Write an enzyme that holds these catalytic residues in place. Sequence first.
Site, short mmCIF file in Angstrom:
data_model
loop_
_atom_site.label_atom_id
_atom_site.label_comp_id
_atom_site.label_asym_id
_atom_site.label_seq_id
_atom_site.Cartn_x
_atom_site.Cartn_y
_atom_site.Cartn_z
N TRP A 1 47.93 85.55 34.48
CA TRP A 1 48.14 84.12 34.71
C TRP A 1 47.53 83.76 36.05
CZ3 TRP A 1 52.51 87.37 33.92
CH2 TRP A 1 53.13 87.80 35.11
N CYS B 1 42.43 92.54 43.46
CA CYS B 1 43.49 91.84 42.75
C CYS B 1 44.83 91.79 43.51
CB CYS B 1 43.73 92.46 41.37
SG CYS B 1 45.08 91.67 40.50
N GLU C 1 43.24 79.58 42.97
CA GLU C 1 42.02 79.85 42.19
C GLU C 1 41.46 78.57 41.55
OE1 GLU C 1 42.05 83.95 39.92
OE2 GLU C 1 44.13 83.18 39.94
N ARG D 1 48.76 92.72 41.53
CA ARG D 1 49.03 94.10 41.12
C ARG D 1 50.50 94.55 41.07
NH1 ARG D 1 44.93 97.58 44.42
NH2 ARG D 1 44.77 95.69 45.74
C1 HEM Z 1 49.29 88.77 36.33
C2 HEM Z 1 48.71 87.78 37.04
C3 HEM Z 1 47.43 88.03 37.88
C4 HEM Z 1 47.10 87.36 38.98
C5 HEM Z 1 47.90 86.24 39.68
C6 HEM Z 1 45.83 87.87 39.43
C7 HEM Z 1 45.20 87.38 40.54
C8 HEM Z 1 43.93 87.72 40.92
C9 HEM Z 1 43.16 87.09 41.97
C10 HEM Z 1 43.67 85.90 42.82
C11 HEM Z 1 42.00 87.73 42.05
C12 HEM Z 1 40.85 87.42 43.03
C13 HEM Z 1 39.60 87.04 42.24
C14 HEM Z 1 39.04 85.70 42.61
O1 HEM Z 1 39.69 84.92 43.33
O2 HEM Z 1 37.91 85.40 42.16
C15 HEM Z 1 41.99 88.79 41.05
C16 HEM Z 1 40.98 89.68 40.79
C17 HEM Z 1 40.99 90.71 39.88
N1 HEM Z 1 42.00 90.98 38.94
FE1 HEM Z 1 43.91 90.21 39.01
N2 HEM Z 1 45.39 88.86 38.57
C18 HEM Z 1 46.35 88.98 37.58
C19 HEM Z 1 46.29 89.84 36.50
C20 HEM Z 1 45.31 90.77 36.27
C21 HEM Z 1 45.16 91.67 35.13
C22 HEM Z 1 46.07 91.73 33.89
C23 HEM Z 1 44.08 92.44 35.36
C24 HEM Z 1 43.46 93.56 34.48
C25 HEM Z 1 44.21 94.34 33.68
C26 HEM Z 1 43.51 92.05 36.62
C27 HEM Z 1 42.41 92.62 37.19
C28 HEM Z 1 41.66 92.08 38.19
C29 HEM Z 1 40.37 92.59 38.62
C30 HEM Z 1 39.58 93.81 38.10
C31 HEM Z 1 39.94 91.68 39.74
C32 HEM Z 1 38.63 91.81 40.54
C33 HEM Z 1 37.42 91.42 39.71
C34 HEM Z 1 37.01 90.02 40.05
O3 HEM Z 1 37.70 89.07 39.58
O4 HEM Z 1 36.00 89.87 40.81
N3 HEM Z 1 44.29 91.04 37.15
N4 HEM Z 1 43.19 88.74 40.38
C1 LIG Z 2 43.03 88.67 34.90
C2 LIG Z 2 42.88 87.67 36.03
C3 LIG Z 2 43.94 86.84 36.43
C4 LIG Z 2 43.72 85.93 37.49
N1 LIG Z 2 44.69 85.11 37.94
N2 LIG Z 2 42.51 85.86 38.10
C5 LIG Z 2 41.49 86.66 37.71
C6 LIG Z 2 40.17 86.57 38.43
C7 LIG Z 2 39.17 85.58 37.83
C8 LIG Z 2 39.80 84.21 37.60
N3 LIG Z 2 39.22 83.36 38.62
C9 LIG Z 2 38.05 83.93 39.26
C10 LIG Z 2 38.06 85.41 38.85
N4 LIG Z 2 36.79 85.91 38.37
C11 LIG Z 2 35.58 85.58 39.10
C12 LIG Z 2 34.35 86.39 38.73
N5 LIG Z 2 34.23 87.63 39.47
C13 LIG Z 2 33.86 87.70 40.88
C14 LIG Z 2 32.99 86.57 41.41
C15 LIG Z 2 31.54 86.70 40.99
C16 LIG Z 2 30.90 87.94 40.83
C17 LIG Z 2 29.56 87.98 40.43
C18 LIG Z 2 28.86 86.79 40.21
C19 LIG Z 2 29.50 85.55 40.38
F1 LIG Z 2 28.86 84.38 40.18
C20 LIG Z 2 30.84 85.51 40.77
C21 LIG Z 2 41.66 87.57 36.68
#
Ligand code: HEM
Ligand SMILES: Cc1cc(N)nc(C[C@H]2CNC[C@@H]2NCCNCCc2cccc(F)c2)c1
Lengths: 402, 403
Positions: free
Chosen positions: B279, B107, B284, B110
């Site tokens: 948000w 993420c 993305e 953070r």
């Molecule tokens: C506040 C604005 C936030 C932004 C801009 C953001 C942005 C992102 C981005 C760009 C990714 C990469 C995932 C991808 O591209 O598929 C990501 C992953 C992740 N985010 Fe953040 N996030 C935000 C808030 C949060 C919050 C509130 C949480 C949880 C409390 C969180 C937890 C995670 C986790 C666990 C992942 C990795 C899991 C996955 O998506 O594969 N994020 N986030």
């Molecule tokens: C909370 C929050 C905020 C923002 N901006 N962004 C996010 C990440 C999610 C939104 N946009 C993509 C991402 N979640 C993608 C799903 N997880 C990893 C990819 C995956 C794993 C396993 C099987 C699959 F097919 C794909 C979370």
Amino acid sequence: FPRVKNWELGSITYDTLCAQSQQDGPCTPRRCLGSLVLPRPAEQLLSQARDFINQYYSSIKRSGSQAHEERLQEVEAEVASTGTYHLRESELVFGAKQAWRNAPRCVGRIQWGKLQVFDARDCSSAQEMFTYICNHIKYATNRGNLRSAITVFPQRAPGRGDFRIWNSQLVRYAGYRQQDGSVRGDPANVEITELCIQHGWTPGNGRFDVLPLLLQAPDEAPELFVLPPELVLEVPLEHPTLEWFAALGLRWYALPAVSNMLLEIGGLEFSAAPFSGWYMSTEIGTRNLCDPHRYNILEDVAVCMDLDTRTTSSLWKDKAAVEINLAVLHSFQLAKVTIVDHHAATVSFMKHLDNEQKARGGCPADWAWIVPPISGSLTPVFHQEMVNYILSPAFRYQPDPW
Amino acid sequence: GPKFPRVKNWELGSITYDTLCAQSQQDGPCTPRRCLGSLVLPAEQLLSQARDFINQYYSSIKRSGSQAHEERLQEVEAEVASTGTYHLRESELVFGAKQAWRNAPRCVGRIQWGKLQVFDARDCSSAQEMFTYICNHIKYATNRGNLRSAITVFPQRAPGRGDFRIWNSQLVRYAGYRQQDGSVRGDPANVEITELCIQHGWTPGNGRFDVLPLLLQAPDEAPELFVLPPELVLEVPLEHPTLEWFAALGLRWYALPAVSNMLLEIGGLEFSAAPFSGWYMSTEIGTRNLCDPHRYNILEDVAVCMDLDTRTTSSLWKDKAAVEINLAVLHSFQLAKVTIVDHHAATVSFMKHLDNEQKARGGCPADWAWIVPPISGSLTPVFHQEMVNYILSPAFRYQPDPW
Ligand code: HEM
Ligand SMILES: Cc1cc(N)nc(C[C@H]2CNC[C@@H]2NCCNCCc2cccc(F)c2)c1
Ligand code: HEM
Ligand SMILES: Cc1cc(N)nc(C[C@H]2CNC[C@@H]2NCCNCCc2cccc(F)c2)c1
Ligand SMILES: C[C@H](O)[C@H](O)[C@H]1CNc2nc(N)[nH]c(=O)c2N1
Ligand SMILES: C[C@H](O)[C@H](O)[C@H]1CNc2nc(N)[nH]c(=O)c2N1
Ligand SMILES: [Zn+2]
């Protein structure tokens, strides 16, 4: 054996090749260090030598023959008496192509079997090194029609200093530190520029001054040699539609030739073994010209384009970067000099992965280096999982000689 | 020097050492023989995990070694000794949820980790109530476009008892309808969940942007189907600042990114249903969701509208179209007054986050391949920053699909 998935297509392979790795990388189960740029006895040499000779005779489909057995005995006889041994030229040629094939950060590996190898192990002076370097450049450049090549200088020996090329590339632009703390020319080459000066070079004061070579024979001071300007092919940069671009006075050299890496074959080490192919456009257009610690031209170009530099959200940086990469492609294509764009290159890399899967059961690849520095996910390699590990023959980093 | 990973920024020439990694108690997939960093998916035990988490909590409030700390420890082991499990105090849940977000290597958002609205839904006892809880989350988080980070935490895994599960991967996703043609209308990422929704009695639409219903599972029950009232689902029609025809494409995306199928682990306790949201970062939507070949795949359409030469790679038609699509996403959200962050501002703020955590914890686990955006990589500061990746708990984890 790791399962390896492509996420665009859903296909899966298993890398079995990684089991052939004898050298540890920087990762452990506790933490991944894959993003780091650099790494933090007769019995040993003998087993590396054997393994490598086994590879060579296997390559020529002569595994287990008389020529194979008698070569293993030659190597054993030589090590036992001298603590070292020597490669036959054909083996060295095999070794060089294999080191390229094995290089996990190289996206151009579909070309791996097409490599002109110059044997320069009969080099006894910095002067002769220069002559060899000059033929390599002439050969590799080939009037814009670039041909991959390597020149191999004498291996390291226990009782003496290394043959070395001090420059990191055979062709690179000077970096002059100015009074006002700013750099004129290429900031990546300040230090080497400064060395050339302390060893007697009369420096220019331009943005694109081709550096001289500091070449070093064992246990001697390095020697300065100026490349004849007619050997160094350069490409002036213009833009297909933006006529003001050429007025920026920007240019780049045709030949990317890495000169400070160590080539390891069969436990033998070659401290000077410069190699060259052709550029992928993002190296110049994105990294060399746009890195903030390089020519850092993004803002200049953006302002010329009349973009809004007040805010990130106008994507002025992305917009300028694309035109700069376009200009590089166009200019090289206009000048008839080999260049490959990051789409064409990554598509051919994907094919390489397929070829290597069939041939060897895998391919060591470093994802962070294979994926280009603009438009990552727009290339197929972004969506391809990759396994990174060290096979030998190998190219390695080595300490700077000074 | 120090027997800890040395970490270099190549733009600036600065060095740090990661000491935080010493705290890692779980192995990733890498070994000295081979790096697997690019892979997307790679009672006595409980007590040690619990004790560790409780130590974490008491350190965070600066009461480590105190009577209250030792009493809580004793209280945790007594619960486990008689029940095989234990339960978190309200404030412990809040801390653990924020910490799990703080610990998430992938993420980039953070910097915001301490600003998280934690909804405690550990009283929830039915699929209908899960629905209510989710709707409240969506309403709070959306806040009419002024987005607020939030997480709603449903009851934890119990021994012998079934899990609470949200079957959907996000609270808001678009349907993907498999055609006779072989192709897909809508989002191809969502074909299976769409087909599960229809099997469980959803009357489907036939559009490119149909909001899916929720399939929600209370313990030991089949999942129930719930349609979100459309007034709760804020969407942004996509238009471009200067390219007037872009609006005619009929593209749109929803405001609220809400991951709903991840497991939140805290002190050995496992919360199988704990959906969270923030948000968007613009890449993305604009790069991945819209331009991936296995997603909406709109690159060619847009390049044709822009009149680019799509027959040759070296025209950089793909790069040009992607930039505009990305700008359209940013412009459209800004116009609509919906929170969004571009890939430059986000990564700049992530670098600030790295510096904060160096001072506070001695490092920050980060997954380089995920932190670096999918367009314009080396144009952002994170490309030039070496990173150390490791697993810290509390954590979010992937978990198997319930079906
Ligand atoms: C506040 C604005 C936030 C932004 C801009 C953001 C942005 C992102 C981005 C760009 C990714 C990469 C995932 C991808 O591209 O598929 C990501 C992953 C992740 N985010 Fe953040 N996030 C935000 C808030 C949060 C919050 C509130 C949480 C949880 C409390 C969180 C937890 C995670 C986790 C666990 C992942 C990795 C899991 C996955 O998506 O594969 N994020 N986030
Ligand atoms: C909370 C929050 C905020 C923002 N901006 N962004 C996010 C990440 C999610 C939104 N946009 C993509 C991402 N979640 C993608 C799903 N997880 C990893 C990819 C995956 C794993 C396993 C099987 C699959 F097919 C794909 C979370
Ligand atoms: C033929 C055209 C070639 C192309 C287009 C190409 C492309 C590239 C690129 C883009 C990189 C990433 C390095 C960076 O961006 O900083 C790279 C690395 C590398 N290449 Fe190739 N290459 C070519 C030929 C060769 C040849 C002939 C050799 C040696 C025989 C070679 C050996 C290497 C090695 C060892 C690396 C890793 C160096 C490092 O770790 O910095 N390449 N190449
Ligand atoms: C043969 C060939 C062809 C092409 N197209 N391309 C290549 C890669 C080189 C050229 N363009 C960049 C790259 N190699 C140059 C820099 N790489 C070493 C990283 C490094 C290490 C230690 C200290 C540093 F400051 C930097 C080779
Ligand atoms: C820190 C990070 O590993 C470093 O910036 C790498 C990333 N990927 C790269 N990839 C290529 N091809 N060339 C590079 O110089 C780099 N730099
Ligand atoms: C194969 C590779 O691991 C995979 O495509 C990853 C790369 N980096 C990513 N980075 C982010 N932020 N999101 C992703 O989905 C991915 N996909
Ligand atoms: Zn690793």
